[PDB]
């Protein structure tokens, strides 16, 4: 009989049951979407969008609803931090219930197509067996996809008839869903411009409509039809798998590097923002402008929003997790409660010191404090018998500005050392570790998990592409080579390898 | 000693109705006892 | 709720073990 790994080939020549299994797969995927959203809703903590946003809670599908304009619950809250909004039916709950009902209906259609597999639509009227006109189906589906792409761009994304999309400020502080106008210039190819996404969907939808029309009307060249085995559905599978792993690589990359479609309020910050101190630079500039007005250190630093400081914390980098450190980031450091304020370390002599932050690479990192001109003035020594730069000997003290510790100064070397270790991680935060029984090791964000899953799946789909392309092009020898095959392979007998007519 | 085929071996059967009945029984037993298992 | 920590595994096995017994017997029937 069929080996286990070949069972599904029973629908290879059965278009009705192929439709059936596709329907069942679609039902399963839609049901997963509905149930995943319901689960996330059942456990989502909506109270504090600032220090406990969705990407700290392991929320995987919620950001994808919010990206396209579904941002409120029936239960009163919205992921933008507001309350009392009325989304109508299209809330998170409404969307999830829609997917559940869709899953059911697709299940029923799959059952019908499984039972009533032998429709005359599927049989070649010229001869009498089942046959699909794959080039024509491509023309149809491509025309349809172009229509849908154009409509998504022109009506949903623009807000002409639809919600628009999530857009945000460069620092992820004011993200919300709005209509977006297309950007038709070169700036439309800036990945951080949402107008580019809108213009893409409009233009690529028109292109898809035109291409579908061409493919609805022009038959393949005979050369192409034979070379690409256009009567073999496995050729479609091969090229589709190729297109799919291409798309998967693209989505993993845009998730990892960030762009307009992967905003940090929904998926968390990127590793590159921590690498370059993007938020640190922005915070420092805001503080320096306040100081340029005349504000004091305490006032200037108290102007800094807690959300902005929260982005500037290494525990929110997606590059700090572990493969088997599962769940929400709150399961790691805990639920963030409040910013402790900005520490400023001064040694005994008045030199003000910068604690070197932990890079993304390092699971552990020595505590080093350097002055303005990049010379180590203090550290925490591993060996103490020849220690010279310790916090104890250097008389390092820390004063806090803004946040919970605003106006407080610590000279006890234990306190200074703990705060130096805290500054190693960026901006300091108090955490509730009791709710999740948080273990102390960092988790990755949904940005990281998404990128990982899709990079791995794309890699494996490369093999799928190779396997199915080879099965398409080598169908004739799948069960083995010809029991003849003597001289065709012999060296030098034929002028052209394989070609019997040549010598 | 030799290994002789045992002539006492007989097929076992569970018809589809028996399958549905047993699956329902197992599901309803699970429904019943899960609350107590969780306590 | 603070439920018995063995509740999920006990429930899953209580259902799954007889389910797979029945499934095996049904599927092989007619062999």
């Amino acid at each position: 009989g069929l080996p286990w790994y070949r069972v599904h080939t029973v629908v290879l020549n059965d278009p009705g049951r192929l439709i059936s299994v596709h329907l069942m797969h679609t039902a399963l995927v839609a049901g997963w979407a509905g149930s995943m959203a319901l689960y996330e809703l059942a456990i989502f903590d909506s109270s504090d969008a600032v220090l406990n946003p969705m990407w700290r809670q392991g929320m995987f599908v919620l950001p994808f609803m919010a990206r396209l304009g579904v941002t409120s619950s029936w239960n009163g809250w919205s992921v933008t931090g507001e309350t009392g909004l009325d989304p109508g039916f299209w809330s998170f709950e409404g969307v999830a219930a829609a997917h559940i009902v869709l899953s059911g209906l697709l299940f029923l259609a799959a059952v019908w197509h499984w039972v009533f597999w032998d429709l005359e639509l599927f049989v070649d009227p010229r001869t009498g067996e089942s046959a699909l006109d794959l080039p024509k189906m491509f023309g149809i589906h491509l025309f349809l996809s172009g229509l849908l792409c154009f409509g998504f761009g022109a009506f949903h994304l623009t807000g002409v008839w639809g919600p628009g999309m999530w857009v945000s400020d460069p620092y992820g502080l004011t993200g919300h869903v709005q209509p977006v106008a297309p950007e038709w210039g070169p700036a439309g190819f800036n990945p951080f411009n949402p107008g580019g996404v809108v213009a893409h969907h409009i233009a690529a939808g028109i292109v898809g409509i035109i291409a579908g029309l061409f493919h609805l009307t022009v038959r393949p060249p005979e050369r192409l039809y034979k070379a690409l085995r256009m009567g073999n559905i496995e050729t479609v599978l091969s090229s589709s798998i190729a297109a799919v792993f291409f798309a998967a690589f693209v989505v993993a990359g845009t998730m990892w590097y960030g762009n307009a479609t992967t905003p940090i309020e929904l998926f968390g910050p990127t590793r590159y923002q921590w690498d370059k101190g993007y938020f640190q630079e922005e915070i420092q500039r805001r503080v320096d402008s306040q100081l340029a007005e005349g504000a004091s250190l305490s006032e200037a630093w108290s102007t800094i929003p807690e959300k902005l400081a929260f982005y500037d914390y290494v525990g929110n980098s997606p590059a700090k997790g572990g493969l088997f450190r599962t769940g929400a980031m709150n399961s790691g450091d805990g639920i963030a409660q409040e910013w402790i304020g900005h520490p400023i370390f001064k040694d005994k002599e008045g030199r003000e010191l910068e604690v070197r932050r932990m890079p993304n690479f390092f699971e552990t990192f020595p505590v080093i404090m350097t002055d303005a001109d990049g010379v180590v003035r203090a550290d925490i020594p591993f060996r103490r018998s020849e220690s010279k730069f310790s916090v104890e000997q250097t008389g390092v003290t820390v004063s806090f500005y803004g946040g919970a510790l605003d106006g407080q100064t610590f000279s006890n070397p234990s306190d200074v050392k703990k705060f130096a270790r805290k500054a190693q991680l960026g901006e300091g935060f108090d955490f509730d570790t009791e709710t999740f029984n948080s273990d102390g090791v960092f988790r990755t964000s949904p940005r990281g998990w998404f990128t990982f899953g899709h990079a791995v799946f794309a890699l494996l789909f490369f093999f799928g592409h190779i396997w199915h392309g080879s099965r398409t092009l080598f169908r004739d020898v799948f069960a083995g080579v010809d029991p003849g095959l003597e001289e065709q392979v012999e060296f030098g007998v034929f002028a052209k390898v394989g070609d019997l007519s040549t010598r | 000693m030799d290994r002789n085929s045992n002539p006492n071996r007989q097929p076992v059967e569970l018809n589809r109705t028996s399958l549905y009945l047993g699956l329902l029984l197992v599901a309803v037993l699970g429904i019943l006892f899960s609350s107590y298992f969780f306590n | 709720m603070q439920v018995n920590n063995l509740g999920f595994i006990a429930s899953i096995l209580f259902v799954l073990v007889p389910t797979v017994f029945l499934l095996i017997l049904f599927i092989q029937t007619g062999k």
Binding site: - | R16, T17, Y20, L23, A27, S34 | I12, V15
Partner: peptide
């Protein structure tokens, strides 16, 4: 999370019902 287990067993029972009805062994006269 025990709610998930309750929902699972209830769904299993209902699914069994649907298959036992839709996909039953036909009664045949012979």
């Amino acid at each position: 999370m025990e709610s998930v287990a309750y929902i699972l067993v209830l769904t299993m029972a209902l699914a069994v019902l649907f298959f036992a009805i839709a996909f039953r062994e036909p009664p045949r006269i012979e």
